[PDB]
Amino acid sequence: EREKLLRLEEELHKRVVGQDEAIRAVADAIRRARAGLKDPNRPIGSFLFLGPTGVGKTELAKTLAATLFDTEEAMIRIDMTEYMEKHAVSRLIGAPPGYVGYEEGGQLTEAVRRRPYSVILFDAIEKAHPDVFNILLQILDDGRLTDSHGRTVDFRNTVIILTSNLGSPLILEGLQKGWPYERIRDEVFKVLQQHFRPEFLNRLDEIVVFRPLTKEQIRQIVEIQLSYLRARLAEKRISLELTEAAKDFLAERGYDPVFGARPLRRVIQRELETPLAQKILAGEVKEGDRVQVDVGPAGLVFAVPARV
Numbered sequence: 395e396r397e398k399l400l401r402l403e404e405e406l407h408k409r410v411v412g413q414d415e416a417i418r419a420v421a422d423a424i425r426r427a428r429a430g431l432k433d434p435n436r437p438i439g440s441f442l443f444l445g446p447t448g449v450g451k452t453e454l455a456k457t458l459a460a461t462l463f464d465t466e467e468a469m470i471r472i473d474m475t476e477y478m479e480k481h482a483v484s485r486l487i488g489a490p491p492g493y494v495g496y497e498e499g500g501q502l503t504e505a506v507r508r509r510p511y512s513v514i515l516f517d518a519i520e521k522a523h524p525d526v527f528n529i530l531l532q533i534l535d536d537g538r539l540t541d542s543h544g545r546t547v548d549f550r551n552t553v554i555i556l557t558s559n560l561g562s563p564l565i566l567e568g569l570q571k572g573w574p575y576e577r578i579r580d581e582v583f584k585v586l587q588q589h590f591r592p593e594f595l596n597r598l599d600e601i602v603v604f605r606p607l608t609k610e611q612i613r614q615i616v617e618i619q620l621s622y623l624r625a626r627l628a629e630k631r632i633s634l635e636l637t638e639a640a641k642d643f644l645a646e647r648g649y650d651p652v653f654g655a656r657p658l659r660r661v662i663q664r665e666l667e668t669p670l671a672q673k674i675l676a677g678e679v680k681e682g683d684r685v686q687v688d689v690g691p692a693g694l695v696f697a698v699p700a701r702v
């Protein structure tokens with residue numbers, strides 16, 4: 395186990411590209427919980443994830459779940475977009491009876507109740523009703539939260555990861571030489587205190603900051619994401635060898651500055667998977683080929699080597 399903990403950044407980067415500054419902070423925070431220098435009555439981790447969207451917030455969250463608890467299923471997501479009113483609370487903990495399916499339970503509690511070794515992701519944390527924070531704050535004090543039926547749900551074995559892009563438009567400046575390692579984590583801290591109570595922020599083990607990806611990185615994701623496709627082709631002994639520009643073509647169409655790498659997968663679907671099929675069906679690509687994918691003025695181009 396100690397081998398996993400000391401090496402924690404390697405095991406994480408296996409799926410998460412760059413963000414070393416982000417990755418180090420969570421791996422140091424986790425090393426602190428284990429080894430025993432924390433309050434035991436607190437979740438294994440609480441982190442504020444700040445940065446743009448599409449740049450890996452969730453990836454890390456899934457990865458952290460996969461590497462820390464043996465699976466990406468070990469991660470409960472709650473979107474704070476759908477919890478913005480008085481009727482918010484009653485979903486998270488399931489606060490009837492009488493009121494609809496309380497006999498079902500509350501989804502935060504119930505999820506944590508059935509799967510206590512998990513990673514809980516709250517997105518858009520700013521959107522939540524100020525009433526929701528009290529609930530989340532007690533979860534960080536005692537590490538324990540009583541549901542509506544008087545079942546106390548035990549969060550002490552979890553990792554809580556909140557996301558927001560409140561600090562983003564003032565992190566796109568840091569990016570430009572000006573501000574280096576810290577100073578962004580710190581100047582952004584001032585904008586958070588303008589939205590969040592300090593009783594909440596000082597429970598958070600860390601506010602981690604997530605820089606945008608650069609065309610050399612997008613490229614690296616571009617590769618990882620073919621994996622399934624590549625695997626699936628392999629069964630037919632087909633290889634899929636790309637070209638530098640071809641990679642760049644993907645990224646270009648696949649990376650919205652405000653929606654990060656979110657689009658790319660479908661992009662790959664539309665620009666690469668689609669035409670590929672025609673050819674495979676049309677017999678342009680036979681079983682057992684080295685496909686040479688590349689760019690053109692009407693999009694990607696596929697060629698095969700003169701057999702032999």
Ligand SMILES: Nc1ncnc2c1ncn2[C@@H]1O[C@H](COP(=O)(O)OP(=O)(O)O)[C@@H](O)[C@H]1O
Nearest residue numbers: 409410411447448449450451452453615655656
């Ligand atoms: N650092 C990263 N490492 C690997 N893949 C990434 C990274 N950042 C983004 N991606 C890719 O982008 C897609 C969505 O990323 P995601 O974490 O959902 O972004 P966000 O949550 O910020 O919108 C994933 O399918 C993933 O493959």
